[PDB]
């Protein structure tokens, strides 16, 4: 059931912003590893004396990488006179975030009908304010509230990327594309699920859609999906959620799930590049798992299509309404914290409805069971 209880009008995921120590090297790594094009910049060359911000795009997916310059470059500035293109940016908050957590997501940004009203309604409904609504060039409004840990939910609304950003010139934007098209969901880890759910669901009106307890929060059309995990203690293998919290110094964003229009092509392109600057993938399931695939999704995937999943290490799950293919990268940076999921959903055609096929929770049982059989 879906009560459609959003307290303000939400459209779609807009962008994800990483807070980095050096935005250049992270953006170039990600661009090559994921096949995203350099689309926009705000930095010294565009008159920004405060922060370096570089935007990568693939389809509707927008990754923003931001790092601070020396505060000395903007010491004369005040907020009314700032050359920063993102008014919420603060040297101290950025350095403190990155020092405490390492490389990771600062902002999950959603496009809303009216960022000012979204901020007002959120805070009136218990959201902790982070950056008040600011109108950029009489064209765009941006506001931020706290989401979990040091991650903010960022609202952007447009009258008609951001003012102050420049479109990068052609020689600098090579048209990489491995098939990734949009952000499917963004998942946080917290020490206690209950209070985090009540806080976020409380100010948004989003409704509810081993080693972990989890629940998914969703907007009215369920195209904005924000799962949250908590650890399950006392268990045999130490909870991966608890390991995240220890190495991240507390709550934060665990994984971004990126939808591909062709997960076979995406994974072929990404795996070709894993050892030459790209991203590594988690270990593949045993051949047991892909033998059992015929019995699970035989009417969905060809024998050749299922063999392709096994070559690429793709996981497949299925619920009442649809089928999802999925795979997970190793952590994106030094710490075992944030990672990426590549996903493609089959079914639920009306457009495809958000969340079609679930989030892969059935693959816990299939993996354990397939692992048991391989040992034989």
> Residues annotated in the binding site for Fe cation, as ranges?
185, 255, 341
Question: Does 342 engage in binding with a second copy (CB under 8 A)?
Answer: no
In terms of CB distance, is 330 or 369 closer to a second copy?
A: 330
In terms of CB distance, is 104 or 357 closer to a second copy?
A: 104
Strand partners, 315: 326
In terms of CB distance, is 118 or 223 closer to ligand A1L4S?
A: 223
In terms of CB distance, is 116 or 249 closer to a second copy?
A: 249
Question: Does 364 engage in binding with ligand A1L4S (CB under 6 A)?
Answer: yes
**Closest separation between CB of residue 62 and a second copy, Å?**
19
Question: Does 160 engage in binding with a second copy (CB under 8 A)?
Answer: no
Question: Does 313 engage in binding with a second copy (CB under 8 A)?
Answer: no
Pairing verdict, β 104-112 and 151-158: parallel
- Residue 315, classified by CB atoms within 10 Å of its CB into exposed (0-12), middle (13-18) or buried (19+), is buried
Of 53, 313, 298, 279, which Cα lies nearest the Cα of 180? 279
Question: Does 267 engage in binding with a second copy (CB under 8 A)?
Answer: no
Question: Does 185 engage in binding with ligand A1L4S (CB under 6 A)?
Answer: yes
Site string for a second copy, 106-145 (x = CB under 8 A): ----------------------------------------
Binding-residue total with ligand A1L4S (CB under 6 A): 17
In terms of CB distance, is 144 or 366 closer to ligand A1L4S?
A: 366
Question: Does 367 engage in binding with ligand A1L4S (CB under 6 A)?
Answer: yes
Q: Footprint of a second copy on residues 318-337 (CB under 8 A)?
A: 332-336
Question: Does 67 engage in binding with a second copy (CB under 8 A)?
Answer: yes
In terms of CB distance, is 29 or 146 closer to a second copy?
A: 29
Question: Does 257 engage in binding with Co ion (CB under 5 A)?
Answer: yes
**At what angle are helices 363-375 and 287-297 packed, to 10 degrees?**
130
216 binds, among Co ion, ligand A1L4S, a second copy, none (CB under 5 to 8 A by kind): ligand A1L4S
Place of tokens 């080693």: 211
Question: Does 283 engage in binding with a second copy (CB under 8 A)?
Answer: no
Instruction: Please give, one letter per residue, the 3-state secondary structure of 191-229.
Output: CCHHHHHHHHHHHHCCEECCCEEEEEEECCCCCCEEEEE
Question: Using CB under 8 A, which of 15, 48, 64, 102 touches a second copy?
Answer: 102
In terms of CB distance, is 38 or 359 closer to Co ion?
A: 359
- What sign does the CA torsion over 363, 369, 373, 376 have? positive
Question: Does 143 engage in binding with Co ion (CB under 5 A)?
Answer: no
Question: Using CB under 8 A, which of 7, 12, 95, 268 touches a second copy?
Answer: 95
Contact 42, 48 (CB under 8 A): yes
Largest CA distance in the chain: 70
Report the distance separating Cα 133 and Cα 116, nearest Å.
Answer: 5
Q: Stretches 45-53, 199-207, 292-300, 356-364: which one binds ligand A1L4S (CB under 6 A)?
A: 356-364
Residues that bind Co ion (CB under 5 A): 257, 341, 359
Residues that bind a second copy (CB under 8 A): 20-26, 28-33, 38, 43-44, 52, 67, 69-70, 72-73, 95, 98-100, 102-103, 171-174, 176, 246-247, 249, 275-278, 332-336
Residues that bind ligand A1L4S (CB under 6 A): 185, 187, 214, 216, 227, 240, 255, 257, 315, 328, 341, 359-361, 363-364, 367
């Amino acid at each position: 059931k879906n009560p459609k209880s959003d307290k303000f009008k939400v459209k779609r995921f807009h962008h994800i912003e990483f807070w980095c120590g050096d935005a250049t090297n992270v953006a170039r790594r990600f661009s090559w590893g994921l096949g995203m094009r350099f689309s926009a910049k705000s930095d010294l060359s565009t008159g920004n004396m405060v922060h370096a911000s570089y935007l990568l795009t693939s389809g509707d997916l927008r990754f923003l990488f931001t790092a601070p310059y020396s505060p000395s470059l903007s010491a004369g500035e005040i907020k009314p006179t700032t050359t920063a293109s993102i008014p919420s940016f603060d040297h101290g908050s950025c350095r403190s975030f990155f020092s405490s957590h390492g490389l990771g997501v600062r902002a999950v940004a959603i496009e809303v009908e009216d960022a000012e009203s979204a901020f007002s309604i959120s805070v009136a409904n218990g959201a902790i304010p982070s950056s008040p609504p600011i109108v950029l060039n009489e064209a765009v409004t941006i506001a931020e509230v706290k989401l979990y840990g040091d991650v903010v939910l960022r609202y952007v609304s447009y009258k008609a990327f951001l003012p102050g950003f420049e479109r990068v010139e052609d020689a600098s934007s090579f048209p990489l594309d491995y098939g990734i098209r949009r952000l499917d969901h963004a998942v946080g880890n917290v020490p206690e699920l209950g209070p985090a759910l009540t806080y976020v669901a409380g100010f948004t009106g989003f409704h509810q859609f081993s080693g972990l307890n989890s629940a998914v929060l969703a907007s009215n059309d369920e195209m904005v999906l924000l799962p949250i995990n908590e650890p399950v203690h006392g268990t045999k293998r130490k909870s991966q959620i608890q390991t995240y919290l220890e190495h991240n110094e507390g709550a934060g964003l665990q994984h971004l799930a990126l939808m591909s229009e062709d997960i076979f092509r995406t994974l072929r392109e990404m795996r070709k590049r894993s050892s030459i600057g790209g991203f590594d993938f988690m270990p593949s399931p045993p051949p047991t798992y892909y033998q059992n695939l015929k019995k699970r999704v035989g009417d969905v995937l060809s024998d050749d299509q299922i063999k392709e999943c096994e070559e690429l290490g793709i996981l497949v799950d299925r619920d009442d309404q649809g089928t999802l293919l999925q795979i997970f990268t190793k952590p994106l940076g030094d710490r075992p914290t944030i990672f990426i999921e590549i996903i493609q959903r089959v079914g639920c055609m009306m457009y495809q409805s958000g969340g079609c096929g679930g989030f892969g929770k059935g693959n816990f049982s299939e993996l354990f069971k397939s692992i048991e059989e391989y040992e034989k």
